[PDB]
Every structure is written in structure tokens, then in C-alpha cells.
Symmetry: C2
Subunit: 180 residues, 2 copies
Amino acid sequence: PKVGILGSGDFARSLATRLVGSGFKVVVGSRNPKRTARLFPSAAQVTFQEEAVSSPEVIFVAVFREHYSSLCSLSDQLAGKILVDVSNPTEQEHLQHRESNAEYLASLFPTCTVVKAFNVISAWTLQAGPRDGNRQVPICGDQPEAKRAVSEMALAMGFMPVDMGSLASAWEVEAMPLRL
Amino acid sequence: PKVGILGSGDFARSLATRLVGSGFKVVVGSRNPKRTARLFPSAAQVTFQEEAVSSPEVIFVAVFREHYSSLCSLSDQLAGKILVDVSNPTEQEHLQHRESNAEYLASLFPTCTVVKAFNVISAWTLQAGPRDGNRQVPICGDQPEAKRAVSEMALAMGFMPVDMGSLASAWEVEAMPLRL
């Protein structure tokens, strides 16, 4: 309660399903909430981006890297919040960009704290799996409190968080293969 | 409009999502609609079994074979309706039972007409895939009008129905491997 999600896609929608099933209150920020709401779990509140980010302490950024900067107008509402970078870049993206997606996201929102998590977990594993016991999510980032909040949430969702250290480890974590 | 689904599980929930995304009005019958509704797409109307099966012409039976007979008290409401058997039996189940699940279901509800379809399609393919591009659903059963109704529905969902003939083909169709 309340956990935030920015995005409207398969991953957003699977995250929301897992969070709702794990007893969290979920608020989703979408550009087209009317259309997006129809497919999302009823227990999730799908709303406009600016309204979705205002309440939660932890916000999953479930959009592609190319659309990160499109969230910049939310900066004032997001200040001091935890942002979770869940992105699973392609091999080419990984090698093309000097910084990790997580670090790029941190640079866009310097008043937020970024945690890398959930990139190795498939959308269907969120929906169906993992199952409520046993499957490892690598976590990093620069703030201990933020990492613990996301780790506890990972635990509540049935995953097993694995601390990979500071946000500088996000690049290596982003190379880890999607399972499976 | 309206298409019915009996059951509460990952497959039910994925079917509902695909149908809603394809412009159908969906009604779900669950024993625990309050709890079940929370995870289902918002556009689906989740309700009690008896109420769920009263309005639709086509009802997807998305429960395990062992629970088919538990639906017998719905017989009066289900009379003359099309039932879709989507079950994907294990190899052991397939070999253990002389008749196909679809034929078993037909035996339980003689005033209904059964169509075998969707057993080869994974829950994630329903959620995410197939894409809206092709991929092949085997269909059979004994009534041409019923098969056409389910085929149009398959097409609207972005699948490609493949006629496998009468319901006596269901056993062979039930042996077909599940596709990711």
C-alpha cells in the first residue's frame, strides 16, 4: 500500500497482478487510463500518470528506456521517491549505452533514488509463477533503505532478493539473462 | 458479447484478458467472485456460477476435468448452449481415460453442444501473444454452427482456427503438445 507502477504494457500489467495477489494496494499511471484499466486487474487503480505517482513511496518504472524522459514532467511529484528500474535491455542496447538504464534513470531524476530489480523475471513468472516460493531477484542501488523496501516487497511477492551492491552494479545486472 | 467463462484460474484469467482485448463482453463464473474479481481484468464481470452462465451463448469451461461434474447443478441454465472444452490433459490423464475430456463433458451436459478448442494455446500466449498475427487453433465437435461460432471468436482473438472434424477427433487433439 500503495505501490505505484508507471506503464500500461504486459510487464506493468503482470507486476500489478502479482502485487495485488500479494496483498499490496496498487496504483497504475497510464497515458490512456480508460483503455488501460479494462485489461488490468480490477483491484489495481489505473489512473493518469500525474495522479498515479503522487501517493506511493515506491514506483515501478515499467516503460522502455526510450520513454524514460517522457516522464520528466512528473519530477516535482516524484521528488524523494523510490524508482524501480525493471528494464531488460537487448544485448545491443546493453552494449550501445555506456551507462545502465538504471543509472540513466537516476540521472533523469536526481531527487529520487533508483533501485534495479526484476529485470531477470519474465512477465509470465510474475503472473503465474514463481510460484510463491524460491526465485532469485538480483537487486542493487546506492541507498540501503530503498533496497530493503524493494527486497521486502520481493519477499512478499514470493521472490528471493539477492543483493548485488551499489547502483554501479546495475550494468552487470542488466546483462543477466531473462528467465526463461 | 457476452461470452462466458467458468473458472477462476490462470487460464480463465488469460482467456478473459484476450477476449476483453478483442472487443468481447466477458462474464466469469466463480465460486468466490469477490476474491476472483480482484485479479481479473476490470472489463470482465466476475460473478457467481449460476448468474455467469445465464446470459452467454458460448461458455468456456476453464476448470480441470476432476471439477466438471461439480458444474452439474448449472444444467438447467446451460441447456442448449455451446460449451468449449479447453483442457490440456497430462500424458497420463490422456492415456487413463478412454474418452476425451471433451466427450466426457458432452456426456455430462447432453442438452449442450461441445467444442474442443484452445488446448494447445498457453495462458501467456492468450495474455501476450499470439500476437494478433496467426497461430493455429485446432477445433472440433459435432455441430457446424457451434464450431463456426468458436472459430469466429478465435479469429477475432488473432488466432487461426483449424478444423479437425467431429468431436470424436477430440482425443487426438487432446494429445497435441502445448505451445509456448
